[PDB]
Ligand binder design. Structure first.
Ligand SMILES: Nc1ncnc2c1ncn2[C@@H]1O[C@H](COP(=O)(O)OP(=O)(O)OP(=O)(O)OP(=O)(O)OC[C@H]2O[C@@H](n3cnc4c(N)ncnc43)[C@H](O)[C@@H]2O)[C@@H](O)[C@H]1O
Ligand SMILES: Nc1ncnc2c1ncn2[C@@H]1O[C@H](COP(=O)(O)OP(=O)(O)OP(=O)(O)OP(=O)(O)OC[C@H]2O[C@@H](n3cnc4c(N)ncnc43)[C@H](O)[C@@H]2O)[C@@H](O)[C@H]1O
Ligand SMILES: Nc1ncnc2c1ncn2[C@@H]1O[C@H](COP(=O)(O)OP(=O)(O)OP(=O)(O)OP(=O)(O)OC[C@H]2O[C@@H](n3cnc4c(N)ncnc43)[C@H](O)[C@@H]2O)[C@@H](O)[C@H]1O
Ligand SMILES: [Mg+2]
Ligand SMILES: [Mg+2]
Ligand SMILES: [Mg+2]
Lengths: 80, 425, 425
């Protein structure tokens, strides 16, 4: 797995970290601290929570995230 | 019979006494720490930074007043310098009515200039220099998304989901607007969307941390200035009054001199409404002489501290608890107040100094090595001054909780001491 | 006239006084150290481990009660946790009626499992699960004589010179049987040789070293629990009473508050028979308020110790000898007792605290770094707590011998002090 993790790097992420609207911001910050800055928001996309969103929050609940203004791309979108 | 009374007096210092707990109905956080030094000079915490050239200049005086205290600008500089320092504190909290703006004609470099020059993170963009009409705003996070470019700020700025607030909206509402829209700037516009001001996250953050700021009746931070007894002090006072100083501190090592008494009286007769703090004295007779001369507040402190210079060099001194109590006893008979200046080393000494009679304590060495203290030069760094003041007032609040003192007047009048022997220390 | 009495009080600490020797008829070993805190709460030594989260949990409370003292389970955990800790002390000395047994059908591995799991050195072997009839016993010294084997325990166990005792035989006789037959286990059987219990050498050894254990009337070790003044303390007390706590300690930094007084009264009216210890107070007026509120024992301690936090931070404190004496004087008028909590640093301070009026002393820092103290984490290791308590009570016994005090009541009422100047120290 370690070898595969190096060989697949510099591709520019098929398996990103995820949360649900039921979780709390305390879950997000700790997932962030363990150095990612964004956590897309179950088994079957609703929002996105980032570090700057945490400045205006107070662990509260993660459902007060970036939910309406969502910019998403298709799978296959080029880096350009 | 002066030969027999030569050794009849006894003197208590801070280390001689402890405050006795009494029935309490107040938590430390609900204790009222305000104090009225005179009808025109009121503090929210009884802490004054000393008029020392290693303690209080404009940065210290602003910090002290922001927390509810008072700063005394030291006298070890010329008269013009000192009027400028008083004026700098009086003009600190201006409320920005005149916001620094720009137009879509300018280049992105123009915007970086403004941000880098003044440590500013945002520029509101108006349609023209005249009909200042808000069109956009530009910020550093915007600059991050651009490789160095001189493109017109108009194709760079934020325009579609632009968030403003009206003139007169509260700081709370301004906060909620910033919190909801996840933005840190809030330009203030009028009915016709003329740019009229700007509110930022850190303007709101500083109101949250300094809500007890001590201000004059026109909303300006209070400040004091130090005066000695020289030939030009009448010119020094005049320029300081012209800078809207809130209180003059006639500051001498031995205030119970006729030259000091005359200086107090001729300033009083020149400026009948001015607030005068006069020290340093340590007896009731000297307190009565300063009040009769025309002083509003009497500063108490001759030789405080076990092994200070006054005691080692001259052999002179009065244990501070006795000094405070004797001077406060005299000052009550005239309806005047007392400032306790000297050997406070722990927060518990503040509670002792105020009980005993002091209306406010003056601190210098404890604040000498702080961030807002003058100079970057032999004092250890003690960090932001608000760290020290926070723990000092935290101890005073704790002591008044033990004493059941809901306000400083109850601590002064009612708190009891118990005398110790010192034996374990 | 509160302004004049501000400095009229004097305060003595432990270092100010020494106890004066008087005519004695009692050796230190013959001194009675028992104390009656109330009709339902009696100690054999006047030592209580403090309700601190670095001092007293179930291990400390069991050790304290084993020696004749008392342990106060601290309140810095949830209500369920604290009821479990009280219950753990109440169930410690169960007397083993239910002995862990086995049958000759099992393998020798089975026996090692039991011994290794519970730190047990012996398994009595019964004929069947039902007619528990003692046939044999197996032990580690037996295991040593076998290379690892699963042979039936029946060809391995001790059967020919098997030694039992009847139910109801004394611990002395049990000892002599073990000493004569050179064995360390003694199974208890009935008339028909049914297995009914087990007595071991180390069960007898622990009775030899802890014969002054303080117990309730049903033979369970006494224990106390700490309560503050919050919203859920009535639920905390209820669960603690349901765990058969012997005494509740309403534990606050300043007990002379009306919120504390109300908490004392509504617990008293809810549980009329419960033992209530309320502190911390340092004046007779506060002692009278706590007793009138419904407290059984008043804990004394505001600012004890020369340079403790209360004095340095708040400027508040009462020298402990004066605090104990003034509070004990008030508590006598109501027939109540006093606990001296604070700055005991030597065993001689215990003798001073109890003379002066204290019925028991509360210790924390002296016991904080002991083996039974909570956690393996910044405190130096001071060894088993019984080493510290042994020397502390050893000094108290010595002091009462010098004072001719045969019991604590004679030390409290009759022992004289001599005031010192401190000059040599
Ligand atoms: N879930 C994950 N799984 C796997 N690997 C992961 C991962 N998350 C991160 N990583 C890895 O972590 C590495 C580190 O890169 P990053 O953590 O992205 O670091 P950065 O680019 O410097 O971001 P920054 O910290 O400046 O973001 P900020 O909140 O200020 O600015 C962000 C702004 O974007 C905004 N935003 C984001 N998505 C938005 C949307 N859909 N709609 C609106 N706004 C959106 C936010 O509101 C906020 O203002 C990445 O290279 C990646 O490999
Ligand atoms: N013209 C002026 N005249 C006088 N004093 C001035 C002044 N401008 C600033 N000051 C003073 O300078 C200080 C203001 O700066 P600071 O308060 O110190 O800086 P900051 O907000 O902590 O900066 P940060 O870097 O985090 O903000 P960002 O770029 O993300 O920026 C916020 C983010 O939100 C967005 N955003 C901001 N306002 C928006 C709006 N109205 N609509 C839409 N998006 C907006 C931005 O695009 C950016 O992404 C205060 O003392 C203030 O009084
Ligand atoms: N079933 C159970 N249920 C509940 N609690 C239990 C328990 N079993 C033990 N406990 C508890 O666990 C502790 C008992 O063990 P410990 O008391 O702690 O152990 P020890 O006696 O110091 O062990 P040692 O290793 O010295 O003994 P040896 O093997 O030589 O053994 C003694 C020697 O004498 C011999 N011997 C013992 N009893 C004999 C007997 N009746 N007849 C003949 N020989 C006997 C043995 O063969 C051996 O040589 C106590 O806390 C006790 O309450
Ligand atoms: Mg960032
Ligand atoms: Mg930012
Ligand atoms: Mg053995």
């Amino acid at each position: 797995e370690q070898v595969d993790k190096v060989k697949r790097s510099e591709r520019g992420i098929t398996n990103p970290f995820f949360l649900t609207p039921d979780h709390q911001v305390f879950d997000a910050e700790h997932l962030m601290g363990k150095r990612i800055s964004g956590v897309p928001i179950e088994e079957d996309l609703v929002g996105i929570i980032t570090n700057r969103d945490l400045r205006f929050i107070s662990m509260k609940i993660s459902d007060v995230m970036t939910k309406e203004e969502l910019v998403t791309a298709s799978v296959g979108t080029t880096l350009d | 019979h002066h030969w027999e009374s030569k050794f009849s007096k006894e003197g208590l210092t801070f280390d001689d006494v402890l405050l006795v707990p009494a029935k309490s109905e107040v938590l430390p956080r609900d204790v009222d720490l305000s104090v009225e030094l005179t009808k025109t000079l009121k503090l929210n915490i009884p802490v004054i930074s000393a008029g020392m050239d290693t303690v209080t200049e404009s940065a210290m005086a602003i910090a002290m007043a922001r927390q509810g205290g008072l700063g005394i600008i030291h006298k070890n500089m010329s008269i013009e310098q000192q009027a400028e320092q008083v004026d700098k504190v009086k003009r600190s909290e201006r409320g920005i009515t005149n916001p620094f703006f720009l137009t879509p004609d300018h280049q992105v470099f123009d915007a970086e200039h403004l941000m880098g020059k003044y440590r500013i993170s945002g520029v509101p963009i108006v349609n023209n220099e005249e009909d200042q009409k808000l069109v956009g705003i530009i910020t550093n996070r915007d600059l991050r998304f651009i490789a160095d470019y001189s493109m017109k700020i108009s194709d760079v700025m934020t325009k579609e989901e632009l968030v403003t607030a009206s003139v007169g909206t509260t700081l709370d509402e301004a906060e909620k607007i910033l919190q909801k829209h996840k933005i840190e700037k809030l330009p203030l516009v009028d009915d016709q969307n003329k740019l009229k001001g700007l509110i930022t996250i850190k303007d709101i953050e500083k109101v949250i941390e300094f809500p007890n700021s001590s201000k004059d009746i026109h909303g300006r931070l209070i400040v004091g200035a130090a005066v000695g007894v020289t030939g030009d002090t009448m010119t020094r006072v005049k320029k300081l009054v012209e800078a809207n100083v809130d209180v003059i501190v006639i500051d001498t090592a031995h205030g119970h001199s006729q030259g000091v008494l005359n200086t107090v009286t001729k300033i009083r007769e020149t400026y009948p409404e001015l607030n005068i703090i006069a020290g340093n004295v340590a007896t009731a007779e000297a307190t009565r002489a300063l009040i009769e001369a025309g002083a509003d507040v009497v500063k108490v402190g001759i030789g405080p501290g076990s092994i200070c210079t006054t005691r080692v060099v001259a052999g002179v001194g009065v244990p501070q608890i006795t000094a405070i109590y004797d001077c406060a006893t005299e000052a009550r008979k005239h309806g005047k107040t007392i400032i306790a200046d000297g050997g406070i080393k722990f927060s518990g000494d503040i509670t002792k100094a105020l009980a005993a009679g002091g209306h406010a304590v003056m601190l210098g060495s404890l604040l000498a090595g702080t961030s807002e203290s003058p100079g970057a030069a032999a004092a250890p760094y003690k960090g932001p001054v608000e760290e020290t003041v926070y723990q000092l007032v935290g101890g005073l609040r704790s002591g008044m909780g033990y004493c059941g003192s809901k306000d400083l007047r109850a601590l002064r009048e009612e708190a009891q001491f118990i005398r110790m022997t010192g034996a374990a220390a």
